[PDB]
Design an enzyme around this catalytic site. Structure first.
Site: not given
Lengths: 389, 389
Positions: B161, B212, B300, B333
């Site tokens: 990531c 995700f 993030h 994400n």
């Protein structure tokens, strides 16, 4: 003529300051490999296939190949010896326990030649096609070596056989744009994802089982050398990547449950022979060189016939490919690290034989590698006078 | 102050010249996903498991996520959903057919904003953790976009990531050391390797199934902008990578025959809060900024709890992390492409709202991404006046 801030950047071109190689202790003579190969893969009943693999192994001109896979290891992981069995987890556990360590053997010796403390290493470029790890081997190597935790790493997974040139191309920009930067370049390759048993229906893939091998190469790259304490070996003048025309699906590799299965449907040597003269002529254009035999050569020996065809196409002296043919014979095809084995061999040969430059007496040199694409990495090299060493 | 001959290098810092995003058409509202997830995997009898997944999905603060995988695609690839069957091959076939194409959609739009011909693109940086291909998606994107076959590609496979920061760190050195160079940066991400049934997961992986999603981001990076034709959006001042202390095996992703199986055995939110202040104080050292609310932020959002912890720790306005929360709610994400999504939303928001600078009125900004290592990428950004746009 124009000027800019020096600021946080470096002044001069990136130089190779050190080179070292490493291989697993275990190795197999190519003359003994067919009988070893068909025994450990439970295929001693495939008599004709065994005879054909014997003739393939003889034509490779390979004499020795180091491999992490022993007869013991293949016994504890029998799925790797099968042609296609779910074994990625097993192959990756071997990659985790060997690939960073093998690169450490090469890095330790390359740092040893460098002579500078490890805390001076600011960047790390790591190439491997032997296992996709998260975190990658660049993290494991950084921890094994004891490098700075704030090092800037660049992990290159599964680029193919051309990643040797890709590493130098990357290192060039990292060293030049950052003053004081010292770039550890490590290419730790192994046949872990490629090794598999023979197939009576996929005889095309026996050729790959006859050439690939294990080995790591480590370089220290940097601009603005401290000539009181450092010794440049080569200069990285230019480095360019290229996709060759009409090369779709030339080299394909699918990462399956049983590792990588390389797909080779297009004639690579004919493809290289059609394009290598034009590509090398563009790389040599700024140098003014107009004779092929007035430069030193580093060609990726992935397929042995290319070395003979390139030599005959450009009318090269039989000695200009001696270092390339030496690594292929003593080590085989170590994926992306092969070209760096050849550079270290070409360096050691030029010094031991009393040649005027590290490039065997020639000023300019060309490094040529290739892989999936059909992708070609071309690096223009500049030797240093051996009297400076 | 020292000075060096410019020669073929660039004079000024790397600039973000254009940026765009793309997502698969198909999306799932997070309020509908638990019923969809447990129906298509035939898990609607696991009531206690499904109730935990509902409470997990409600806490994510996500309202929708775009995904390539539809019910028709899962039925046409039952290996992905079947616990008893391998599936890496089916996942890579889906990756070959979507990951480069998704990046093409994002790249074409960014080039349209850029305004210059494709032939002026000299470098390509491609990041994906959703499919190891040989040749990689960098080759595929190059063929689909019609970029020059001599482009300098840099394929980053399965870095995790944090690769959003890694790509900016790579593009900075590519652009600044090569005058006239223009770097296309593409991060195309998807869940094609991590998606599986709920009973096939542990606790930690069940939360990953709620966060995700799929999406691609594309930037144009370059130094010395032709102000007659180009419009910088941000400047990449510095970019560092750090391994956090006492973070061995904090995030691990093992690529197996069933796909990418993640592991998060350590408290990642606690790791970030322990070190974020020290890491950002070093990045802001040459700026003179003293107050945390005097810059813009790109964090993030892979762990939504980290946003609320960093908010209270650094005593930030609830308005500071606005752009980061908009992407998390609207897209989930998207692996490495998420931080770049946030950078584009921060730009568009600041421009449409009439802020003085593209950093929402502020001059300096930090971008902060993390992944396996525990690795931390940190980019120092400088905004530009919106009046230039």
């Amino acid at each position: 003529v124009e000027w800019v801030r020096k600021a946080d950047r470096a002044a001069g071109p990136a130089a190779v300051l050190a080179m070292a190689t490493a291989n697993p202790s275990n190795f197999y003579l190519q003359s003994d490999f067919p009988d070893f190969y068909f025994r450990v893969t439970r295929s001693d009943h495939m008599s004709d296939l065994k005879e054909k693999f014997k003739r393939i192994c003889k034509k490779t001109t390979v004499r020795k190949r180091h491999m992490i896979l022993t007869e013991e290891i293949l016994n504890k992981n029998p799925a790797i010896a099968d042609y296609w069995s779910p074994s990625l987890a097993a192959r990756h556990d071997l990659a985790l326990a060997n690939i960073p360590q093998l690169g450490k053997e090469a890095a330790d010796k390359a740092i040893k030649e460098w002579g500078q403390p490890k805390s001076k290493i600011t960047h790390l470029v790591f190439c491997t096609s032997a296992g996709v790890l998260m975190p990658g081997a660049d993290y494991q190597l950084t921890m094994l070596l004891g490098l700075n935790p704030s090092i800037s790493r660049l992990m290159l997974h599964n680029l193919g056989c051309y990643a040797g040139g890709t590493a130098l191309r990357v290192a060039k920009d990292l060293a030049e744009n950052n003053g004081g930067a010292r770039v550890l370049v490590v290419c730790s390759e192994a046949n872990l994802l490629n090794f598999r048993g023979p197939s009576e229906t996929h005889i095309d893939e026996l050729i790959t089982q006859s050439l690939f091998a294990d080995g790591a190469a480590a370089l220290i790259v940097g601009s603005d050398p401290d000539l009181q304490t450092e010794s440049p070996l080569y200069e990285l003048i230019s480095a360019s990547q290229r996709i060759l025309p009409e090369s779709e699906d030339a080299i394909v590799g699918r990462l399956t449950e049983a590792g990588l299965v390389p797909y080779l449907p297009k004639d690579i040597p004919k493809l290289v022979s059609t394009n290598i003269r034009s590509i090398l002529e563009d790389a040599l254009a700024p140098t003014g060189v107009q004779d092929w035999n007035s430069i030193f050569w580093i060609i990726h020996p992935g397929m042995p016939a290319i070395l003979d065809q390139t030599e005959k196409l450009l009318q090269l002296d039989k000695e200009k490919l001696k270092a390339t043919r030496h690594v292929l014979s003593e080590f085989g095809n170590m994926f992306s690290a092969t070209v760096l084995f050849i550079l270290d061999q070409l360096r050691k040969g030029a010094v031991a034989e009393g040649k005027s430059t590290t490039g065997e007496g020639c000023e300019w040199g060309v490094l040529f590698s290739f892989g999936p694409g059909f992708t070609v990495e071309t690096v223009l090299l500049r030797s240093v006078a051996t009297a400076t060493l």
